[PDB]
């Protein structure tokens, strides 16, 4: 009767992928600004 | 001691069972336990 995890596994995958993408974007911006400061 | 005919009715040993009140935490029933646990994990990670 209960809805199983396989029924909604894709939205979990999407959520974790979005968390990874946000981490990657933030780290890329941090690296870019760190290089910018080191140059200036 | 007596002569039987072919069976006019076939039977065997079988199980008679009886023929539910909602549980206290039955509001969690629509989703599986793994879904709730992974929801908590996803909340922490988010």
From Swiss-Prot, chain B:
Cellular localization per UniProt: Cell membrane; Postsynaptic cell membrane; Postsynaptic density membrane
Quaternary structure annotation from Swiss-Prot or TrEMBL: Homotetramer or heterotetramer of pore-forming glutamate receptor subunits. Tetramers may be formed by the dimerization of dimers. Interacts with PICK1, GRIP1 and GRIP2. Found in a complex with GRIA1, GRIA2, GRIA4, CNIH2, CNIH3, CACNG2, CACNG3, CACNG4, CACNG5, CACNG7 and CACNG8. Interacts with CACNG5. Found in a complex with GRIA1, GRIA2, GRIA4, DLG4, CACNG8 and CNIH2.
Included stretch of the parent chain: 512 to 560 of 888
Family that this chain belongs to: Belongs to the glutamate-gated ion channel (TC 1.A.10.1) family. GRIA3 subfamily.
Segments crossing the lipid bilayer: 33-46
Functional summary from the UniProt entry: Ionotropic glutamate receptor that functions as a ligand-gated cation channel, gated by L-glutamate and glutamatergic agonists such as alpha-amino-3-hydroxy-5-methyl-4-isoxazolepropionic acid (AMPA), quisqualic acid, and kainic acid. L-glutamate acts as an excitatory neurotransmitter at many synapses in the central nervous system and plays an important role in fast excitatory synaptic transmission by inducing long-term potentiation.
Protein name: Glutamate receptor 3
Domain of life, source organism: Eukaryota
